[PDB]
Amino acid sequence: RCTTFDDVQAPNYTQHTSSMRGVYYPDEIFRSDTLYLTQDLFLPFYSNVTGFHTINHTFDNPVIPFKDGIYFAATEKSNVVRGWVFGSTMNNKSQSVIIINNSTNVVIRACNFELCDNPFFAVSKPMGTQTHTMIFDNAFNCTFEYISDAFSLDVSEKSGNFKHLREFVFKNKDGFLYVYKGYQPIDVVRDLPSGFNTLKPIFKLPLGINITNFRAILTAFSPTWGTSAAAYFVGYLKPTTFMLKYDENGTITDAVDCSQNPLAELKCS
Ligand SMILES: *[C@@H]1O[C@H](CO)[C@@H](O[C@@H]2O[C@H](CO)[C@@H](O)[C@H](O)[C@H]2NC(C)=O)[C@H](O)[C@H]1NC(C)=O
Ligand SMILES: *[C@@H]1O[C@H](CO)[C@@H](O)[C@H](O)[C@H]1NC(C)=O
């Protein structure tokens, strides 16, 4: 059973900056102590980024075009952003893959899903426990199934600053859904803080599905819906030439966006 919310305020599509975020290890090669020039799908430095903010009567989960791949950040203190649906029609007329953390397991399922237009987890604000999981009402022709080892995640509403910055890069390449991940702690009340955090590949999903759109799977907090403060950010990957500095320990510690300006475009420098 799918549930829509009553009086949702429309999204504002606020604009923010990506600073120097979104850099990821572009492949599996273990380069070390070198500079590496490549042309790949990168998020250019100081690109515009769309901020979807959940607060008060606002609950931003619209269908967002996937295009050539995305950078996706989330500023969190109450584990609101819990997953994504990647697909095309977002109907059960086509294949979709759901990638979620449902508070005990990480689930990745590629099926013909009867998606809820307003998919959400629901948590009791007084009881502090997850009560509902309403993402789809039916599923058939399931093509991919992954369920992680069990864990225990704090689902309850928290107060104060956003303490967790969770970054991801999603690409559809060679029939695979590449999922890159990075994390860093923060303490901020708004916006996507400036910084640099290389993302590492965590999934290379052999789905082979058409992914033109996606939707964020969020968390409503009820005491009959309600919200808790959160925000995610979508940037679009573009074909760009980057120079990645692989340190002596094999770590990407710095990068130059060669299209940023002629000073950067010193071949590059
Ligand atoms: C998160 O999803 C997992 C996977 O569907 C759930 O684990 C399964 O739960 C069902 C009953 O709900 C059991 O029959 C299965 O044996 C479980 N599978 C595994 C691998 O443990 C889990 O219960 C879900 N968590 C929440 C909080 O809904
Ligand atoms: C999903 O497919 C079933 C039949 O397979 C159909 O009854 C249902 O209406 C579809 N979903 C939606 C949202 O229409």
Residue numbers in the entry: 18 to 240, 244 to 289
Which lines from the publication concern this structure?
The key determinant of host specificity is the envelope-located trimeric spike (S) glycoprotein, which can be further cleaved by host proteases into an N-terminal S1 subunit and a membrane-bound C-terminal S2 region. For both MERS-CoV and SARS-CoV S proteins, the S2 subunit is mainly composed of α-helices and forms the stem region of the S protein.
To date, little is known about the structural and functional information of NTDs for the MERS-CoV or SARS-CoV S proteins, though its counterparts from other CoVs, such as mouse hepatitis virus (MHV) and bovine coronavirus (BCoV), act as receptor binding domains and their crystal structures have already been delineated. By contrast, the NTD domain is observed with strong and clear density, forming a stable triangular platform on the top of the S trimer.
